[PDB]
Paper text:
[name]-WT crystals belonged to P1 space group and diffracted to 2.4 Å. Molecular replacement yielded a clear solution of 4 tetramers in the asymmetric unit with R/Rfree of 0,25/0,26, respectively. Similarly to other NAD-dependent dehydrogenases, the active sites are located in the cleft between two domains: an N-terminal cofactor-binding domain containing a parallel structure of first six beta-sheets (Rossmann-fold) and C-terminal substrate-binding domain. The oligomeric surfaces of [name] can be split into two major groups: AB and AC. These surfaces comprise 1852.9 Å2 (AB) and 1372.1 Å2 (AC), respectively. Active sites from subunits A and B mirror each other and are located in close proximity to the AB interface (but well separated from each other and interface residues) and distal to the AC interface. The AB interface is mainly formed by residues that belong to alpha helixes 1, 2, 5 and 8 from both subunits. The loop region between α6 and β8 of each subunit (residues 187–192) was found reaching in the hydrophobic pocket region between β7 and β10 of adjacent subunit, facilitating the AC oligomeric contact. Analysis of the crystal structure of [name] showed that AB assembly is highly similar to that of the active E. coli dimer. Significantly reduced specific activity, decreased thermal stability and a shift to a lower oligomeric state observed for [name]-V190W and [name]-E18W mutants suggest that tetrameric assembly of [name] is crucial for its catalytic activity, although the AC and AB interfaces are well separated from the active sites.
Residue numbers in the entry:
A (entry chain E), B (entry chain F), C (entry chain H), E (entry chain K): 1 to 313
D (entry chain G): 1 to 81, 86 to 313
Write the structure that this text describes.
């Protein structure tokens, strides 16, 4: 009975649709502006479903009114960046697209939970909130689960441990101003600081890893000639799951801050829980230095958001 | 310990890599000729693995010698057809690529099981056997599972039943001369003929379905502007699973015929079992009319396979 | 949000609860009459859930009113048979228990889909219908999927093939009068009759297999000193999945016949589809000899159902 | 091709077999001393495998020589449950199983589960003649799942990414480490500062973790079976897929945590080559508690060897 | 080619034969035990046929073997009640006659559809089923259509409307325990309850009408000194037409209940469809009070049916 609407049928959207089918999360509605594309991917997904013994319904469509009564909305519509570009270079063209999608969600399914993925991520979440007229808890963006996966992955490789239970908090905008928190990094519970004391990893090695984490999105673009699609989709699917199954998992994602971390009235990457009712920020006690870094990331997001609202007229 | 080598890091390869990681089938070796592309898709797949709690090793490489000691080899290297083209139009350019891959497999990992996917499928399997010097049971091509999934999917939709236990045999080349067998179609055990007698489906509706099955590959190209990727990858994975886990499953795939179905010395789509030791054809009793249709399909594959050998000089 | 209520917290109920947690099918309500048993198994299941990263809610209870608003009800309450006993020997004691459970479902959650499992299976489904006041499509019993799995498993072994795509129809009561249909047995689409023509299996070997399928329930009791628990639970879970996910799968189960197969006003093992709306019988064209065997099975179920109603006063 | 041998076909063994089938880990060999039991559970399990589309091979047997060439061995043989009788009755059984593994499949990776856990792992090592990295016992994972589950409930969070380290014997002398408890990376101490949980609530949780195994016996009238089996599976997975995951399990210490020549619950990585201990920097107070748990295990292990004559 | 056999050539049988001729329903076989009577009525009916241009064959006979290969059988054999008698007073004499007719139908034309009319109706249908060995859907009794005509006729008179499209359901035995359903009474689609709201008829007037409907059979006997013949024949002919022409019309008639309306293993007046395959009960949702009344009627039929079986030894 659950309806999952993918607004954008590109790489990310299709794989999200594929992952949703694998766990039987819901019926799919594959929407795109370009005719034929969602219908074709829907056909390929049905044949996939038939081989793997999944039976959920899959509808490829160019009529955005088919998004009606979606329980979940994943928004990937928009352009992606190429080599040499920053995420922020998409601000002009994607803001306009995000506004249009916001206006459509507003009239067709105002009760949905909305996961935004168009870049630049934090900014585009703010745009969606402005024109959608949905409650702020019902809107979020994925990024932090992606950036955390890259940072944990690298930490795991340097410590010669499984990535499976390397956990971390990354605060701030999905960009060059991310703030990975060493204090809030653990390896199956054990703080990262223990592994520095045991000489298994050095402060310099960690700064190196933080740098690779920041650039990773660009590095994949450079190597693969396309932007990361599998990891983003997995992250998204994890956030859909936490909503549908009322799991109340504690992630980083772009969420409405409201007095938390000295910030108010802005969607930005932060610690949050996701459950039945949406995405709910949680404030943890930062050090002065940590908070100072975070606030600096928050300032860019503020600026670039305003820039976006301006460029939309 | 199992090594799975994906020769070709395009759409199909990457998704196959994805599905192998989801079931922990083995460590991945992502190979492509184009520099950077495998390394980037490996990075994205690592991050995907970290988020889903899979821990297998993933290596993106341009050095084909990294394929050494692969247990499994999936070949997608080659060009894909565009709108208006037939699969057979690729014969010239893909034959040459398949030969080169054959030669590399020959010197680097002669003990592997080899699933060919490059088009036109049956033809390219015959090229790979010629220049690879591997036993014929250790080589096959995936197609029948994809064509079957399409046909069964359509049968299921018309009968208002789950596709989950709709099974069927499609013989012949992956092309316009497929031979779907009504007699060998069942719905959780019940032959298709019972549903015609019960007036739940008509002989004309079935012929319509057979036509859509034949043209499906082209239809997806037309709609999606790219060829099918998810369903092919799922089919491939199913054949990998049947080899690794010695399952002895009965599929249709491009296999070496040797006195079966009045055919010898040719890889062509047929009923086969896959296990530990490779792909083994099985002959079932066809009617005169069925065999005639099958022989006709076999003839095209014969011709076009000769053409492919000729055009390689 | 989905609530799955297990009326009976023995072996079968707990394993069904386990499988439902593995696929995230819903929140569990474990009910039993015996104090402390459901609470303890619930604790074990929560810890199991923690290890495997499942997060659904699990409540062990002795208050049957906790069953309120269950979407799904699985009934295993009742006594199981020992060595030397038939399923029919339980008629007296389990009929009374089934009536009590029927009455409780009637007042506490009349909108649920109800899978009966207490023996003798077909008879107890009829008892539940009588005292529950639920629509007949919302009530069924699992047996045919179990018997079919046994018969298909044995056929697969003899043919040296994967059981994975061996499908079959078994009609009739869950007992010595089952009617496995050779005509409706296939191996990945290929009818069983093709394998007899190819001399891979004989008519005698098939009769032997039918006999083992009939006695299997008793043979496991003899060997294991307890009745089968894992396969029953898997079957049950497969029917739950078909209902929750609106799959419309075609099984055999105990279902309300209404002019189908010359039978009316009786729950008995038959071919049926399960979807959103419940269990719906489907009639396939039987031969005279097949229908005669089926009618004979139906007659026992008739007699024994009457016996059960009589013994309830 | 992988062969998984379940020495003991009771509740735990069967469910382990069930979980192995669900992930296609390997062919099963179900062994028990009682005739008929394994054959019957094997039949059920084949039917279960048919319904769920798994195809691995399952053999029920009473001939221990069928254990030959097992890549993995899970030992649940023994009685569940005067303590000098437990340690008394199961020590003898464990020795007999050790001897059999010695002659029939010396290359196997061995997970011991018979109680009292730690003690019995040490008995297995003494009479099996297998390398010490190839032997371990599951217990930590189970105690950690209980503790993390309770923490998660109190904090109103998913248990999914609550991780923790619990050191020491599987018993009243467990040492849960608050410092090594996190919630998707965030240390438990941040939640006490935020007043989402109190030090007393934690001590309460530690106590319930210690008594859990008894509480389930009391309530269910049988010992826990589903969680133990999941734990065991998780270790099997880490070995077969060379995952190198960091668990707490009973493992051979050798200069780690001031302890040498003993199997005891400790932080370890499991891969292709077996279980390998890893030492983390404990505080004095933490190490003191851990040493105390290690002393019991020492004493009782001696007791066990003594009672075996 | 259709053969219609009238077992009993009294008033009803002859008139049924007349109506069947008028609509060309089939060739007639007029059977009676009394010599000469069927031959003489057959002569009169031939001459009737000649005048009205009907050309079906008509055979008057005392040899019951002439009933062979009848497609339809109408049983009016038996004694009719006089003034002061109930229908139940015939139980002794007619039960024995019905059994004898049952035995004859059994050996001479087991494939026929059988409409029983001898009184007391419901009881005598049950006797025929017991000794005939015919499927229960191939046996029914006419009564409800008669009682309905009477009730509808009286409703029409009081509302000053055509009886033509006044329809109703009357459940239960053909006797003093009939249950006419006000809820299931309509005037060309408009429920009876609309006419009470409009003050065109009162609840008391309706109860009066129900009473006259119950006693109508006796009132005609008192006035005409013979029992009703024209209406019974018309009703019978309507049930013949529905069978021959596969009309699937929804009547009330004595039909085999099998879990419908909390009743099993008894022929009693109920809602049913008549088609090619026979008479098939249909259960509609009754109120508690309606069902209670119906059950009470079913109880008498039960008792008297037992009485009938007893008196037959």
């Amino acid at each position: 009975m659950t309806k999952i609407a993918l607004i954008g049928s590109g790489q990310i959207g299709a794989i999200v649709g594929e992952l949703c089918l694998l766990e039987n999360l819901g019926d799919l509605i594959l929407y795109d502006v370009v005719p034929g594309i969602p219908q074709g991917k829907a056909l390929d997904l049905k044949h996939f479903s038939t081989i793997l013994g999944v039976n959920r319904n899959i509808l490829g469509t160019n009529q955005i009114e088919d998004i009606k009564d979606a329980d979940i909305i994943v928004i990937t519509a928009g352009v992606q960046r190429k080599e040499g570009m920053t995420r922020e270079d998409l601000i002009g063209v994607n803001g306009k697209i995000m506004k249009s999608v916001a206006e459509s969600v507003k009239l067709h399914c105002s009760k949905a939970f909305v996961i935004c993925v168009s870049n630049p991520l934090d900014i585009m979440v703010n745009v969606f909130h402005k024109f959608s007229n949905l409650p702020h808890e019902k809107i979020c963006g994925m990024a932090g689960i992606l950036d955390t996966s890259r940072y944990c992955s690298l930490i795991a490789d340097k410590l010669k441990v499984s990535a499976e239970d390397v956990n971390a908090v990354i605060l701030g905008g999905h960009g060059d101003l991310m703030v990975p928190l060493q204090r809030y990094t653990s390896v199956n519970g054990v703080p990262l600081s223990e592994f520095v004391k045991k000489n298994m990893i050095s402060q310099n090695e960690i700064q190196e890893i933080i740098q690779k984490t920041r650039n990773m999105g660009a590095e994949i673009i450079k190597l693969a000639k396309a932007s990361a699609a599998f990891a983003p989709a997995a992250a998204i699917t994890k956030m859909i799951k936490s909503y549908l199954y009322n799991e109340n998992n504690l992630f980083t994602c772009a969420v409405y801050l409201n007095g938390h971390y000295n910030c108010s009235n802005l969607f930005v990457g932060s610690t949050a829980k996701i459950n039945n009712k949406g995405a709910h920020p949680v404030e943890f006690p930062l050090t002065k230095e940590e908070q100072d870094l975070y606030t600096e990331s928050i300032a860019s997001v503020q600026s670039n958001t305003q820039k976006a609202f301006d460029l939309i007229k």
